[PDB]
Write a protein that binds this DNA or RNA. Structure first.
Ligand SMILES: [Zn+2]
Ligand SMILES: [Zn+2]
Ligand SMILES: [Zn+2]
Ligand SMILES: [Zn+2]
Lengths: 82, 69, 104, 96, 93, 69, 105, 93, 96, 78
DNA sequence: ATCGGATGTATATATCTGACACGTGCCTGGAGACTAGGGAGTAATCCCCTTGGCGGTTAAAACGCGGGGGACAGCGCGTACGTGCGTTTAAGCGGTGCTAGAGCTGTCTACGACCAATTGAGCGGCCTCGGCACCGGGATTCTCGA
DNA sequence: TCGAGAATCCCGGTGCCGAGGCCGCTCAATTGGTCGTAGACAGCTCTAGCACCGCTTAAACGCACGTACGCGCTGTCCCCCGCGTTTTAACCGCCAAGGGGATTACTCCCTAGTCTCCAGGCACGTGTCAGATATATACATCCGAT
C-alpha cells in the first residue's frame, strides 16, 4: 500500500512552474492550494482512463486510454500516437 | 440501582408532556419546535393565549401539528 | 494505369481518403468528387505550417524541425492559433513574455 | 562581499525557465503519486511506460496556464504577490 | 502486422517548400496526428450537415460548406479556392 | 430485576433515532409526522431517496422541521 | 400482439428507440437488448426532473408547471446543474441572490 | 403530415409522480427537446467506443459504460441499476 | 419633502428584476439591429418571426451572465463600482 | 442601429445581474461587446440557410448555429 | 550621473555517437471494365405567412439640478519573503532475472438482417369548462429624521 | 430612542382562452421463417512490465539577516444617484398584396457491387554526419563608493 505521496511535489518544483508562468513574488500559502488543485485534477482523468481500460477487459493502462480520456473533456494532446 | 432509576426518570421527563405530566408528547408547533401532548394544547388555545410556554413565540391554530413516537 | 492523385495533381492519397470516408459510418453514400476536394484541403493545411516551422528553425541556425519550432510557428500566427485553440503540444514550451510592470 | 537586490535573481530565473522545454517535476515521486491515486479505483493495475509520461506531460501545462491567469488576477488589484484569493477567483471565473 | 500513416506524404510535401531541411522523428508523429484530427472534424461536420436536409449522400458541396463553417477567416477563403480548382482539373481528364 | 430494565429499554428505543441508533430524535417530517435524526436525514436526502422509510410517501427538503426534546 | 414496452414493464416506446438507433448511422448492426436499456435510463431521468419541478410548482401555490419552475428545479440540484451546465432555458430567469458586501451596514 | 414527439409519454410519466398536476405547452416543448438531446449525447458515445475496439455491433454493454462516462455522481449508479433491472426483466419471457 | 439615501432604491430593483422573467430590451429597435447586421453577409433576406425571438433570448442570457462575472472582479479590487477595465479582465480569463 | 440599445435597458440588465453601482463608460463598451456577439452567430445562421437553397432564415438555423458554438438553447424546437 | 570590480552570458574550436535517410521484396489494397436500380433534379401549383401602411394611447425615454458618498493619492510601520551557505537525502543510471499478460490463429454456433401479411397505437381536428389574471379588504413589518 | 409615510394581507367575486378529453383513420410496429457472418473460446508465443542491487552527486533542506512591500489611516473633491417635467415613439388593432415554402409526378444517370490484375508502400537492413558536450575567451550587466 502507498500513502502520503502528495508531498513529493516539493516547494522548488512548484516555484519553478510559477517562474515559467511568469510570476515574481510568491506567498507562503500557495503550495497547499496548488497541491489540492493538482490532486483534484488528476482524479478526473485517471477515472476515465480506468473506465476505458476496464471496458476492453484488459489489465494495463495504455497511452491510448489516457489520450481518449483527455480528449473527452476538451484537452486534446498531440504527440503520443492519438 | 440509583443510576438506572435516575436514567428512567430523566427519560420520563423527556417522553412525557411537561405541563400535564400524565400524557405522552404527541403535539408540536412549527414556530419554535417545542413538543407537548395533544390534550394540553386545545385548552391552552381555548384560553385565548398565543404565547409559547417556553420561548414566548407567537402561534396560531394553523401552527399545530401531530407527531408520532 | 494512373492513380487518381496524379490525375488531380496532388500529393495526398485520394483512394485511401475515399476508403476511410466509406468505412467510417458518415453516410449511406459517398460522392465521386468528395475525396478529391477533401484531400486538396488537407494538403494545403499541412503545407501551410511546415513553411512557418522551417522559417522558425532557420533562425536558430538549425537544419531540422523539432516540436519547439512547431509550437513557435503555431502560437505566433493569429488565424492559425484559433484553429489549435484547446490543443497542447508535447515538448513545446511556452512563448516568452513578461508583464511590463514587473520590470525595474 | 557581493549581494544582489531582492528581485533581480527571480527576474533572471523567469527568462531562463521560459526558454527551455523540459519537465520541472521529478519522475519517481510523480509515478508513485499516480499509482496511489489509481489504486482506489481498481486494485493491482499495471501502467504502460508511456502512460505515465503522457499524464505528466498533460498535467503541467494546466498548472502553467493557471499561474498565468493568477498573475493577471493579482496585478488587477495593484499587487505583485500572488495569493490563494487569486487562484480561487481564476478558477471561479473559468467555470470550475 | 502493419500500420498506415501519413509520413511519406508529409515528407514529400516538406521537400517542396524547404528543399534542405529535415524533420525529427518526434515531430513527425505530431503532424501525423494533426492531419487525422482535422480530417475527423471536417467529416463529422459534413455528416450531420447532410443529415439535417434529409439527404443520403455526401457530395463536394457538403464539405465545401463544412470548410466555411470550421476554418476561421482568411484561411477558409484560401482553402476553398485550393479545393475547387483541384476538382475541376480532375473532371477535365 | 428486568421489569425496570425493560421499561428503560422501551424508553431507550423511543428516545434515540430508530435509523442510526446513536443520536437524539430532532428532525420531523411534515408529510407523515415521523421523527428521525438530522444525521440520517441529510444522508438520505443526498442519496436521492426522498421517501419516508416507514410510511413511504415522498417528501421534499423543505419538509424537514427541527424540533427540541 | 403485445408491445415490447409492456413486456419490459416500461413507459417509453422501445420500438421507436430501436428504429431511431438503427436509422441514425451509429453502427453496422445494433443488439436486441440496447433499446430496452436506453429507454429505461431516459424515463428515469425524465421522472427525476419532473418530480422536482412539481415540488417547486406546489411551493408557489400553483398547479401547472411553467419554465420558471423547471429552471428553479434544475439550478438547485448540484448533479442536475452539472449535467446542464451549458444549457439555457427560455423564459427561465435567474436564481435570487445578493452578495454580502453590497448589503447595508 | 405527421410529426413525432415524446409529449404523450412525458405526460403519462407525469401522471405517476403527481396525480393532480398539469403542464403548460412551453414546458412540454422544453421537456421534449431535453430528451432528444440526452438520447443523442448517450448514443454518440457508444458508437465511438465500439469503433475503438474494432467492433461493428453496439450492445447493452456500450450503453452501460457510456452512462458511467456521461452521468455524474449518484445519477450514474441509479440509472445503471434501473436499466439493468429492466433488461433482466425483459429477457425472462 | 421626502428623499431616499443613495443606495436603498438601487437595492429594490435588484430584488424586483431577479424575480421576474420577461425580456428587458424593446423589441422593435432590437429587430431593426439584427436586420441591419445581417445585411452585409447576404442582401434581400427574410426572417421568420421566431428567429428574432430566439436571437434576443440568446443575447439576454449572455449579457446577464457577463455582468454577473464582472461584479466579482470589481469586488476583488475593493470597489463597489464596475469599470470598463473589469469587463476586459473577465473576457480575457474566460478565453475570448 | 446600435443606438437603440438605450442606457436604461443596460441598467436593467445590470440590475438583474446583481450590481449596485455603475460607472459612466460602461454603455459604450457593452454595445461593442453585443455587436461582436451578434455578428458571430448571424454568419453561421446565414451559411446554414444558404446551403439549403432557401431565402428566409428560419428558427432551426439559429438554434443549430448556437449549438455549434457551445451554447445550446431549449424551448424552440429540437 | 560617474566609473570600476565582479559575475553571468555569448562565441569559436575538437570529437564523436546514435538517429535519420536511402535501398530491397513482397504482398495486399487500389485501378479497369460492366451491370442494375433507386436517389435526386426538374416542372407545376397553391396556399400560408411575410412585409408594408395607418391612427390613438400612453408608457418609457431624455434633460436638468442638487448633494453626499465613494474613489484615489499620500504616509508610516512592521512582518513576511528573497538571497546565500553548509549539511543531508534520495533521485538517477547501469545491469540482471522472472513471469504475467498482450497478441495472434483456428473452429464453430447462436444471433441479427431481410422479407411478407396484419392490425391496433398514435396523430390531426373539434369542443368545453375551469385555472389563472385583475379588485378591493383588514392582519403584521419596511424606513429615516429627530 | 419612536412616530409618520409608504408597503403588507388575508379572502369573496368576475371573466376568458388554452389545456384536456373524445373520435376517425392510416401505417408503423409485431409474428413468423431463413441464412450467413461476427464473435466467443481454447491454445500458444514472446515481450515488456516489475523487482532488486550498488554507486555517484545533484538537489532538497534548514538557518540567519535585511529590506522592500502589504495594509491601515486620513483628507479632498467630483461624479453618480434621486426626483420632477417634457418630448417620443413603441405597442396594438386593422387591412391588403404577393413571394416562396412545401408537396406531388416523372425520369435518368450515378453509385454500389463483382471480378481480375499488379504496382505502391511497409517492414527490414545499413552507413555517416548534425548536434551534444567540453573549453578558452570576450563582453554585457549589476551594484557600490563618489
Ligand atoms: Zn400535556
Ligand atoms: Zn417555544
Ligand atoms: Zn439517525
Ligand atoms: Zn412517514
Amino acid at each position: 500500500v502507498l500513502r502520503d505521496n502528495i508531498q513529493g511535489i516539493t516547494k522548488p518544483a512548484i516555484r519553478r512552474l510559477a517562474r515559467r508562468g511568469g510570476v515574481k513574488r510568491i506567498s507562503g500559502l500557495i503550495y497547499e492550494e496548488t497541491r489540492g488543485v493538482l490532486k483534484v485534477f488528476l482524479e478526473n482523468v485517471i477515472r476515465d482512463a480506468v473506465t476505458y481500460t476496464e471496458h476492453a477487459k484488459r489489465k494495463t493502462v495504455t497511452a491510448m486510454d489516457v489520450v481518449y480520456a483527455l480528449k473527452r473533456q476538451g484537452r486534446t494532446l498531440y504527440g503520443f500516437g492519438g | 440501582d440509583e443510576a438506572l432509576v435516575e436514567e428512567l426518570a430523566n427519560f420520563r421527563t423527556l417522553v412525557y408532556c411537561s405541563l400535564c405530566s400524565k400524557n405522552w408528547k404527541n403535539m408540536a408547533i412549527k414556530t419554535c419546535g417545542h413538543v407537548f401532548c395533544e390534550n394540553c394544547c386545545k385548552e391552552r388555545l381555548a384560553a385565548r393565549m398565543r404565547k409559547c410556554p417556553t420561548c414566548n413565540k407567537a402561534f396560531s391554530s394553523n401552527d399545530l401539528l401531530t407527531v408520532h413516537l | 494505369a494512373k492513380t487518381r492523385s496524379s490525375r488531380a495533381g496532388l500529393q495526398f492519397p485520394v483512394g485511401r481518403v475515399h476508403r476511410l470516408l466509406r468505412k467510417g459510418n458518415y453516410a449511406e453514400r459517398v460522392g465521386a468528387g468528395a475525396p478529391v476536394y477533401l484531400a486538396a484541403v488537407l494538403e494545403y493545411l499541412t503545407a501551410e505550417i511546415l513553411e512557418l516551422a522551417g522559417n522558425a528553425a532557420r533562425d536558430n541556425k538549425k537544419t531540422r524541425i523539432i516540436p519547439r519550432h512547431l509550437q513557435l510557428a503555431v502560437r505566433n500566427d493569429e488565424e492559425l492559433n484559433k484553429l489549435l485553440g484547446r490543443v497542447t503540444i508535447a515538448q513545446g514550451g511556452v512563448l516568452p513574455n513578461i508583464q511590463s510592470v514587473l520590470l525595474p | 562581499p557581493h549581494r544582489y537586490r531582492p528581485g533581480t535573481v527571480a527576474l533572471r530565473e523567469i527568462r531562463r525557465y521560459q526558454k527551455s522545454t523540459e519537465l520541472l517535476i521529478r519522475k519517481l515521486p510523480f509515478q508513485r503519486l499516480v499509482r496511489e491515486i489509481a489504486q482506489d479505483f481498481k486494485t493491482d493495475l499495471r501502467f504502460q511506460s508511456s502512460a505515465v509520461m503522457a499524464l505528466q506531460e498533460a498535467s503541467e501545462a494546466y498548472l502553467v496556464a493557471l499561474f498565468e491567469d493568477t498573475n493577471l488576477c493579482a496585478i488587477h488589484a495593484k499587487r505583485v504577490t500572488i495569493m490563494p484569493k487569486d487562484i480561487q477567483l481564476a478558477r471561479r471565473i473559468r467555470g470550475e | 502486422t502493419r500500420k498506415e500513416s501519413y509520413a511519406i506524404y508529409v515528407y514529400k510535401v516538406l521537400k517542396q517548400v524547404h528543399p534542405d531541411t529535415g524533420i525529427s522523428s518526434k515531430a513527425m508523429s505530431i503532424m501525423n496526428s494533426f492531419v487525422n484530427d482535422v480530417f475527423e472534424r471536417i467529416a463529422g461536420e459534413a455528416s450531420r450537415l447532410a443529415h439535417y436536409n434529409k439527404r443520403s449522400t455526401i457530395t463536394s458541396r457538403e464539405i465545401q460548406t463544412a470548410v466555411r463553417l470550421l476554418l476561421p477567416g482568411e484561411l477558409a477563403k484560401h482553402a476553398v479556392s485550393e479545393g475547387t480548382k483541384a476538382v475541376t482539373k480532375y473532371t477535365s481528364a
